[PDB]
Design an enzyme around this catalytic site. Structure first.
Site, PDB file in Angstrom:
ATOM      1  N   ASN A  94       0.811  -1.230   0.000  1.00  0.00           N
ATOM      2  CA  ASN A  94       0.000   0.000   0.000  1.00  0.00           C
ATOM      3  C   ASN A  94       0.849   1.287   0.000  1.00  0.00           C
ATOM      4  O   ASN A  94       0.339   2.346   0.345  1.00  0.00           O
ATOM      5  CB  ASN A  94      -0.988   0.006   1.178  1.00  0.00           C
ATOM      6  N   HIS A 142       3.049   2.303   2.023  1.00  0.00           N
ATOM      7  CA  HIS A 142       3.421   2.777   3.363  1.00  0.00           C
ATOM      8  C   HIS A 142       4.743   2.122   3.785  1.00  0.00           C
ATOM      9  O   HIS A 142       5.079   1.067   3.265  1.00  0.00           O
ATOM     10  CB  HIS A 142       2.326   2.423   4.390  1.00  0.00           C
ATOM     11  N   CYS A 156       6.252   7.042   9.257  1.00  0.00           N
ATOM     12  CA  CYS A 156       7.259   7.733   8.463  1.00  0.00           C
ATOM     13  C   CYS A 156       6.773   7.602   7.019  1.00  0.00           C
ATOM     14  O   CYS A 156       6.422   6.506   6.564  1.00  0.00           O
ATOM     15  CB  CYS A 156       8.650   7.119   8.647  1.00  0.00           C
TER      16      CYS A 156
END
Ligand SMILES: CC(=O)N1c2ccccc2CC[C@H]1C
Ligand SMILES: CC(=O)N1c2ccccc2CC[C@H]1C
EC number: 3.1.2.14
Lengths: 268, 269
Positions: free
Chosen positions: A190, A192, A227
């Site tokens: 995804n 991330h 992050c």
């Protein structure tokens, strides 16, 4: 891999690969963390959750909610060697409206002895606004059937390392690794940043001498913020003692905290 | 995994893991490269080479010699999806005194169709002085028994992409990724930087838009020098072209010392 006969836990065997080991020819704590994550995905798939999102119930999907890790705790007795088979058993348990807890047991497939154990706390959040929320009763009722009803804890000990409060590292840090950026291999499907990257980033501030002469026994990691792909991270470490360290991951610019944790090491 | 009936090649199946896939839910080119590397280690172990060093013969060990990659070429037709089984067949061939060549064939275990292929050139080098050398006859004879005698090439074709000369990128580069440092996960068991990290570093200068709208078909990568644990690398890229082509260059920040050069070919989804 497969669910156990009762359908309340999942088991999977893994052969330790050549690129997964460190200088001692045994799996790194990041390889272990990735295997824990993989067996958790497989458990979610074997019980009905789709590949669109990680264990999102039908009501979670219509409300745009996702499971996020709040805490990860890992204790290793023996790191499996390159070529060995490690068997991991995982299960999930409901923790009322606080959220969910996932536990793991690591074993040597040849001997059957427990060689490691992990526990993680998962909380509910809106995928779009990123706002944490308590689990609603109708979401809890859709997943409780996949959990053991009685408590089944990898860390039973009433006063254990997995539930201890983690303090914030005070400046100046003793050790530091500045300018850490994630690359495409650090991102999940995804886009991330993968939770295992934060483990590797926390360990980057540990001096090479400590890694060469010690073995990591415990690592407890709290997740405060994500992050992003274009963020730069500083990894800070201070000795608090076996060897013990206090850790802090913060954004390079404004000093925004993303992670905090502790590690315990044994002399070889 | 296991050697084939003749003991001249090795086969292994892999299930594609959740953390090994990208945005399209298919394995990344770095996952493939790692699997190629793993099946090559297993082939070396299945034929007698110890876990102390990668495919080092008995004479190589007493002379302090190791195998180093000089070139890697990978062509992917279909990236296996998360949950699929990919079967890889690998073999090594002697290339006289130049060195050796390792080839790979990737197949869908369910259909048997070839979904990718790779080739690599390995050269001899002193473990301590780092000085390349031609392969002596004493060494060649000790490993020739593990290779097919007749040529068996993953890339047979008259003038294929795997043997093309790669030019040096001229400054200024069109795209760049500055300040790339390896972390402990990027190091192999001997504390050296893994060859697959250079692939990821070369791809970092490719804009996100090209990655989001294109699929990597080919990647050819020449290895000139090793990046050490405490080195910082700059990744440079320039478009050289339905399909997109790029010229790549990996160099140290502290002096511009070249460590890698290569090319990538992409197609529209
Ligand atoms: C997030 C998570 O791991 N979950 C899961 C996954 C697989 C099998 C059961 C469960 C409980 C429901 C949910 C909380
Ligand atoms: C470096 C390399 O991959 N080699 C190898 C490995 C496994 C099985 C056979 C061979 C040929 C000998 C040698 C050249």
């Amino acid at each position: 891999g497969s669910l156990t006969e009762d359908g309340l836990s999942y088991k999977e065997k893994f052969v330790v690969r050549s690129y997964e080991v460190g200088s001692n020819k045994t799996a790194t704590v990041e390889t272990i963390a990735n295997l824990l994550q993989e067996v958790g995905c497989n458990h979610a798939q074997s019980v009905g959750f789709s590949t669109d999102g990680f264990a999102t119930t039908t009501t979670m999907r219509k409300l745009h909610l996702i499971w996020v890790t709040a805490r990860m705790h890992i204790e290793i007795y023996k790191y499996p060697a390159w070529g060995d088979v490690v068997e991991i058993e995982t299960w999930c348990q409901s923790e009322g409206r606080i959220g969910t807890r996932r536990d793991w047991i690591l074993k040597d497939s040849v001997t059957g002895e427990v060689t490691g154990r992990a526990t993680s706390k998962w909380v509910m959040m809106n995928q779009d606004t990123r706002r944490l929320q308590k689990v609603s009763d109708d979401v809890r009722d859709e997943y409780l059937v996949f959990c053991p009803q009685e408590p089944r804890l990898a860390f039973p000990e009433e006063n254990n390392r997995s539930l201890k409060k983690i303090p914030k590292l005070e400046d100046p840090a003793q050790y530091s690794m500045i300018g850490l950026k994630p690359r495409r291999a650090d991102l999940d499907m995804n886009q991330h940043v993968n939770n295992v990257t934060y483990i590797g980033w926390v360990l980057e501030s540990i001096p090479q001498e400590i890694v060469d002469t010690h073995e990591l026994q415990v690592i407890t990691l709290d997740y405060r913020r994500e992050c992003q792909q274009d963020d730069v991270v500083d990894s800070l470490t201070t000795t608090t003692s076996d060897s013990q360290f206090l850790h802090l991951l913060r954004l390079s610019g404004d000093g925004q905290e993303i992670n905090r944790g502790t590690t315990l090491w044994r002399k070889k």
